[PDB]
């Protein structure tokens, strides 16, 4: 049951697992209401793997800087098999290669509010002590503002632990002192990724919610707003002070 | 014993020595399991370097920027002889590009911690 049949070709995607060919999308077509759906062959030796939580995700070709392979590049688009577990089925749903995150066994899945979005995309990598342990899912605009929705693997699942703060890593941030010269939000490898760091803590409950703090020093303060309380309020007639 | 078929075609990549072609990747099958394996002739003149500690290295091409090789580039992975000494050995393990530095005779490993990554990757 495909997204849509974009790049998709019958008798020519294959699908592809542990780099090898195993099935080939041999029937693809619209169905009456705009759905699109196909099937597939696949390999009688692999059929044990067709389970439950099995999953099938259709990967687009990456530019790899690395390995610039030219073949990824002309097949296009692809099929992959990855397993899981149950009983055996033959109706599948392909995930998106984005949304592959989100169908997982176990994925700690958060929704955090923000008042802007502060250039956060749907694409942007999710960083803890510097190592990625999740994505951001996708991004919503509310009335009160963005809503952007996450994920985390379920390997790093258990350092998140109920209490964290979450910090915009998107947008460069310079601040000049006298002896407070610093550089937050983002270094300049880790800019063009963008995304969303992680303080973690040490216990919690998970809750539903969580703020989105514009930069690391309002995340220490705890202030999600931008205007503080007024803890105490005084009455001068003329005094030459400070205007804030 | 391959991590994973991800370029390799059979019968067309090839094993990979002082520049010179020795051998081809003959069969290339998935076990049960998810293991994926495969076999690979080589020329009688070289059967004296499979040796105990001969490796093999799957290579990916890579862009160098000096010498734009553009049948590099379309070859894709290859694999690569490195010999060693000892006993002559059949069975082989294929350690991935990157691992090929850990895989040595003598070999230098350190495990060092840190309270972030600061951005240091593998």
Do not use: C
Not at 178 to 199: K, P, Q
Request: proline letters at 7%; a negative charge.
């Amino acid at each position: 049951e495909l997204p849509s049949g974009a790049g998709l070709t019958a008798d020519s995607t294959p699908l592809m697992y542990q780099g090898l060919e195993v099935g080939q999308l041999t029937k693809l077509d619209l169905n009456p209401g705009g759905k699109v759906t196909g099937e597939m062959t696949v390999d009688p030796s692999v059929v044990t793997l067709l389970r439950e939580n099995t999953r099938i995700e259709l990967r687009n070709p990456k530019l790899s800087l690395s390995d610039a392979n030219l073949s990824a590049l002309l097949t296009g688009k692809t099929f992959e098999l990855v397993p899981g577990d149950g009983e055996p089925r033959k109706e599948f749903v392909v995930v998106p290669g984005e949304k592959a995150l989100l169908h997982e066994p176990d994925v700690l899945t958060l929704t955090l509010t923000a008042p802007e979005s502060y250039g956060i995309d749907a694409g942007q990598p999710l960083i803890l002590h510097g190592v990625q342990v999740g994505q951001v899912i996708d991004r919503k605009l509310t009335s009160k503002g963005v809503t952007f929705t996450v994920a985390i693997e379920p390997q790093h699942r258990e350092l998140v632990k109920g209490d964290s703060k979450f910090v915009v890593n998107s947008r460069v941030d310079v601040k000049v002192g006298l002896d407070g010269v610093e550089f937050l939000g983002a270094s300049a490898s880790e800019w063009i990724n963008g995304g969303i760091r992680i303080l973690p803590g040490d216990k919690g409950e998970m809750k539903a919610s969580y703020p989105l703090y514009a930069n690391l020093e309002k995340a220490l303060e705890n202030s999600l707003s931008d205007l503080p309380t007024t803890t105490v309020s005084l009455s001068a007639e003329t005094l030459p002070d400070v205007q804030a």
